[PDB]
Write a protein that binds this DNA or RNA. Structure first.
Ligand SMILES: Nc1ncnc2c1ncn2[C@@H]1O[C@H](COP(=O)(O)OP(=O)(O)O)[C@@H](O)[C@H]1O
Ligand SMILES: [Mg+2]
Lengths: 100, 98, 257, 417, 49, 256
DNA sequence: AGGGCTGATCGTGCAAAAGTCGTGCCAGCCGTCT
DNA sequence: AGACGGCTGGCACGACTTTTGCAATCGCAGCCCT
């Protein structure tokens, strides 16, 4: 399936996501040090059978179902700085444009 | 295969080169010879195919000596089983604590 | 929602007919139009199909007079197999065109008596005649009619059976005559002139002459169709480079000199 | 011109069904067809470094093994720990039971208590998600790692202890009655459970190479563009002209006959390739006849598509079109879909229309998007919404579409506000 | 891995894990056995080199 | 330029040509009031010369003779229906030239159903098909020509009045051979040159006053057919004669 | 001297049984309110 | 605290699809059997 940016990264703290906007990119003018998340991207996973284990896990937790994996863009280590501006290009035929 | 990694460039295609291209050539050529002889083929075509096969094996061993094999869109030669032994970029190099 | 372009005219009869069409629109009953030749009854029927039928309902305009061979008219009813020279594939489609829609016809006078009787025995019960051996289909199709001749006239002639004439004519929609409309006729003429000026892609105004209007009043114009208006607009088109045209030609053979 | 069973005209054509023709169709085997063509061309006579970084973490399994080895463990203890670590899934839950591990040990001295102690030492491993049990146990481990100041931690622990079934069925009434749950306290507990890192091992496996095949192209620049169906990837192989000339110049009559047979086979292959290309072009034209309408209208506005109707429009054989549809992929600006996915299911719709089952499913998904988060929309509510849309789809059809859309159950999807 | 080709099973050794290519006999409890539907020794991945 | 076939020096001919040029700029039905042997597609040739689809020539080919069932089949052709097989829309009148202008002749012989189909063709109408539904709509202009006064036939009730009226958007009257008197000599000279070219004759050796008098006295029913026959006879005779040879006439029957 | 008879070359389909989907519908069950 | 309701899912029956399993007879004429 296609991969989209919607900032729904599992197995991550709210503080790391505390600076992320809804579409996933960071606000203009921020600062960053280390390996902080910049753009939130996930990878879809293949569907499974009934499989009562994660069926129960989804029934209790939900909204993840292990459907996606954490594949977000992060700053390389030993790098600290501040952002100037962002830019995104979308091909014709796709009009998600959450914050484009 | 552990010595000849797939090394995907684009992820879509593994594109193994310089280690499996010549293997692919020799494998397909040998299969063609091997079903060819059992079909009672005429002499001309079988000797031509065997000459192709011997040339391919030679190129797999040493390409620089005999023949010139190049990759897609690149005219540079291939790195044969002897190429990764000899020269500044062989196994013996970088063996001396490189 | 979407309204087809129509000529503007002060014809309260036309508005009453439109209101009656709207009233019968929720209704699903046979509709008969008394439209004479060139009255554009087909346009009225289509406008009905916009509202009288369900939204985006199938429509079909097949004229019985257009039928060539009565054997083909039989083929207009579905043939299963073993019909005509080639029985490989058979799909009349008229009943399929009928299914999920209404039925519209023009000049239903010319039909053979057998054709009309079969039409009655199909419409009244709702079952579909099949040329090939098959169970008939009760296709729910409305029926709309538009003919010139009087129904009692054919009854006196006997062409339509009493059962057929009755069950065929459930509602009557008399089309106003073109000669009946005088001021509405002039307004529709002006509107058609504007539409023709737009169509011809001529920026200059068409223009009219009082003598031309008097002559048009003299013209019988039995057909209220755009065709008579198109003929008038063509007589105008024969004149160019003048803001207001003068005179007109009744027929091309007329005034040959 | 209506006589029946008259004089029969002489047939001037034949079916000529050949297994060669069927193989030429290849059911549009595409890459498989390419491999078959390569095999035939090999069987047909007279026919035709990188960077290599090699560096990646072993999904923390190597990291876990090192950390366990980093901790001081006895040789037997190290072996037991390695065996336990081997019994780790990507999610982080143990596939084998403790009894299975003890049986794999095959030692009379090895016991359940020692195995449990080893697992518990292994359970508190280096990374999160090393519980090797249900996520509730992993949730307990996370809560132990989490500060005790978190509200409703004791209530969450009590619920996870033996009231897990109550949480699974979202039976708020019975769960609250049993656990004396306060109003909106369950909301706080649910919010805390949201930050429980379910499937922690999935995040560790951040690497995920992309897999996609070009196949057909639906770029359609400026509308109706002839986006070739991977014309570059099409083999278009040809026989050896020089060898053919040698066969033409063969002195031996038998050799010349063999060369002629090879040339006939090559002509058959050329005809097969030309037929494949022509079928691809015709299918592209037929799809483009209505693909733009579907793309602009949307997935929920998808008209039904009939393979027989498409073949009739293309005027080719219906069975041929059906065979071509199989094992065919068409990448589009919207995305890559199968030819069957390109085709649309048939379902009745109101107002003299036909609605695709996928169209109804997309409409139902859009409706499910517009729903109260606390209470999921009922299938009866979905049927009412469909009736509002006028798609002539009842409760059964709505349920089928929901199964296609994997809509959760109304009670299961129901949650507190 | 392909069948009787480059980068294949039953040749050059087992796959990334002890799990067999077919899918059965996937456990360290199997140490030297070989499955029937697939012929692969249940061993480490390093031996592939 | 269409080789300017049958260049008529008559002023009425020039006016008719200008009107035809105006009609070809248009894409609406138009009636050509012609007569037998007169204006045999020459006006149609001029229209194609001035057609909006100048690059893409129209079907033309208005002239056609066929049975009633045959004409109906020419209107509607389906592969399964009728005797012929595997050929649907075998005539393909609209399929012959998209847009352009559909051309018809001898509409008098057309049946009432045939006339009704013609009328539906005159307005925006769907194609005719023996079986199924023909939602296919191919826009194309209309041209037609008959030698009779259809006003009488409508008065006689031999043709659809609606078809006669709507088709008669603008009747293109045509002049016959009897109409052409002064241009007759020019047409004869042009035909002589064309025959000398085709018959490999060195040139037009010349005419005779007796030959001109006989040609004038000749009824000459065809506008060019009489001219064609006279030219053929003169080419056959003078080719051996290498002289005017008085008048050479062609008769279906010869005695003594 | 007369009969047998042998293999070259002979090109876009389909249909019929099977399968499978659309749609409707009944039977039980749990959440609930009486 | 037993019944209202809606779900869900199995169960069924027509309507559309679709896949595989299907190729002689030549017109040459020389060779072999009789
Ligand atoms: N009220 C109106 N406004 C505009 N056009 C009209 C009106 N009534 C009739 N017409 C025109 O008359 C033409 C033919 O009308 P009609 O006689 O109903 O067709 P038919 O010959 O099929 O009966 C149509 O093209 C239509 O545009
Ligand atoms: Mg009409």
């Amino acid at each position: 399936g296609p991969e989209e940016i919607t900032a729904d990264i599992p197995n991550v703290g709210e503080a790391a996501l505390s600076k992320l906007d809804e579409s996933g990119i960071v606000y203009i003018g921020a600062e960053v040090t280390g390996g902080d998340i910049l753009v939130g991207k996930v990878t879809p996973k293949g569907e499974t059978q009934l499989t009562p284990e994660e069926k129960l896990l989804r029934a209790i937790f939900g909204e993840k179902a292990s459907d996606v994996k954490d594949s977000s863009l992060r700053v390389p280590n030993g790098v600290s700085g501040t952002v100037i501006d962002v830019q995104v290009f979308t091909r014709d035929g796709v009009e998600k444009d959450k914050r484009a | 295969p552990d010595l000849r990694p797939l090394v995907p460039l684009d992820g879509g295609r593994f594109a193994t080169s310089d280690l499996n291209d010549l293997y692919r050539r020799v494998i397909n050529r040998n299969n063609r010879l091997k079903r060819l002889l059992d079909l009672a083929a005429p002499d001309i075509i079988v000797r031509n195919e065997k000459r192709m096969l011997q040339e391919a094996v030679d190129a797999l061993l040493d390409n620089g000596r005999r023949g010139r094999a190049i990759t897609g869109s690149n005219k540079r030669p291939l790195k044969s089983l002897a190429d990764m032994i000899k020269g500044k970029q062989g196994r013996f190099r970088q063996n001396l604590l490189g | 929602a979407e309204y087809k372009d129509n000529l503007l005219g002060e014809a309260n009869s036309f508005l009453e007919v439109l209101e009656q069409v709207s009233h019968l629109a929720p209704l699903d009953k046979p509709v008969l139009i008394i439209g004479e030749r060139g009255t554009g009854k087909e346009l009225i029927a289509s406008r009905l199909h916009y509202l009288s039928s369900r939204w985006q309902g199938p429509f079909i305009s097949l004229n019985c007079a257009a039928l060539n061979e009565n054997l083909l008219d039989s083929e207009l009813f579905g043939h299963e197999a073993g019909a005509f020279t080639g029985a490989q594939k058979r799909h009349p489609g008229r009943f399929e065109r009928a299914d999920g829609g209404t039925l519209f016809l023009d000049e239903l006078a010319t039909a053979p008596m057998m054709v009309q009787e079969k039409l009655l025995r199909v419409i009244e019960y709702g079952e579909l005649e099949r040329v090939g051996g098959s169970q008939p289909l009760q296709v729910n199709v409305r029926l709309v009619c538009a003919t010139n001749a009087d129904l009692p006239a054919m009854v006196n002639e006997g062409t339509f059976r009493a059962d057929l004439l009755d069950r065929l004519a459930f509602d009557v929609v008399q089309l106003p005559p073109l000669r009946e409309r005088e001021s509405d006729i002039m307004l529709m003429a002006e509107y058609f002139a504007i539409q023709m000026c737009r169509e011809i892609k001529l920026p200059l105004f068409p223009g009219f002459t009082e003598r031309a209007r008097e002559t048009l009043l003299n013209y019988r114009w039995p057909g209220n169709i755009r065709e008579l208006k198109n003929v008038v607009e063509r007589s105008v088109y024969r004149h160019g480079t003048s803001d207001y045209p003068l005179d007109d030609i009744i027929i091309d053979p007329f005034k040959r000199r | 011109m209506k006589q029946g069973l008259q004089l029969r005209l002489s047939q001037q054509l034949a079916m000529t069904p050949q297994l060669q023709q069927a193989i030429r169709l290849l059911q549009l085997s595409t890459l498989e067809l390419q491999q078959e063509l390569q095999q035939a061309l090999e069987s047909n006579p007279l026919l035709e470094l990188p960077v290599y970084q090699g560096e990646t973490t072993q999904t923390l399994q190597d990291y876990l093994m090192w950390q366990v080895e980093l901790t001081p463990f006895t040789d037997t203890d190290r072996a037991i720990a390695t065996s336990i670590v081997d019994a780790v899934d990507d999610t982080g839950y143990l596939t084998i039971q403790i009894e299975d591990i003890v049986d794999s040990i095959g030692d009379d001295e090895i016991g359940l208590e020692e195995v449990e102690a080893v697992l518990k030492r292994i359970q508190r491993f280096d990374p999160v998600g090393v519980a090797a049990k249900d996520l509730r146990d992993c949730l307990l481990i996370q809560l132990s790692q989490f500060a005790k100041e978190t509200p409703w931690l004791e209530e969450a622990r009590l619920i996870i202890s033996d009231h897990l079934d109550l949480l699974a069925n979202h039976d708020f009434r019975t769960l609250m009655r049993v656990t004396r749950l306060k109003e909106e306290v369950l909301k706080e507990a649910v919010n805390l459970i949201q930050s429980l890192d379910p499937r922690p091992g999935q995040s560790i496996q951040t690497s995920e190479p992309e897999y996609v095949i070009p196949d057909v192209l639906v770029r359609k620049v400026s509308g109706r563009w002839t986006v070739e169906l991977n014309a570059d990837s099409i083999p278009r192989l040809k026989i050896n002209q020089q060898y053919a000339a040698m066969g033409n110049s063969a002195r031996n009559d038998a050799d010349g006959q063999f060369i002629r047979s090879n040339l006939q086979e090559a002509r058959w292959l050329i005809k097969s390739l030309e037929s494949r290309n022509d079928t691809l072009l015709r299918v592209s034209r037929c799809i483009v006849e209505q693909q733009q309408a579907f793309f602009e209208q949307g997935e929920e506005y998808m008209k039904p598509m009939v393979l027989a109707d498409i073949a009739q429009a293309v005027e080719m054989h219906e069975s041929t079109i059906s065979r071509v549809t199989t094992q065919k992929y068409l990448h589009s600006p919207r995305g890559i879909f199968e030819l069957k996915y390109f085709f649309s299911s048939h379902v009745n719709t109101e107002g003299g229309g036909e609605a695709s089952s996928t169209a109804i499913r997309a409409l139902v998904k859009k409706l499910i998007a517009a729903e109260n988060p606390a209470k999921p929309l009922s299938d009866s509510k979905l049927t009412s919404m469909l009736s509002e849309q006028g798609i002539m789809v009842a409760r059964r059809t709505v349920a089928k579409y929901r199964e296609s859309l994997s809509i959760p159950p109304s009670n299961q999807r129901k949650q507190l506000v | 891995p392909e069948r009787d080709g480059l980068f294949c099973a039953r040749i050059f050794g087992p796959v990334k894990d002890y799990e067999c290519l077919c899918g059965k006999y996937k456990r360290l409890k199997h140490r030297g056995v070989i499955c029937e539907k697939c012929g692969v020794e249940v061993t480490q991945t390093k031996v592939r080199r």
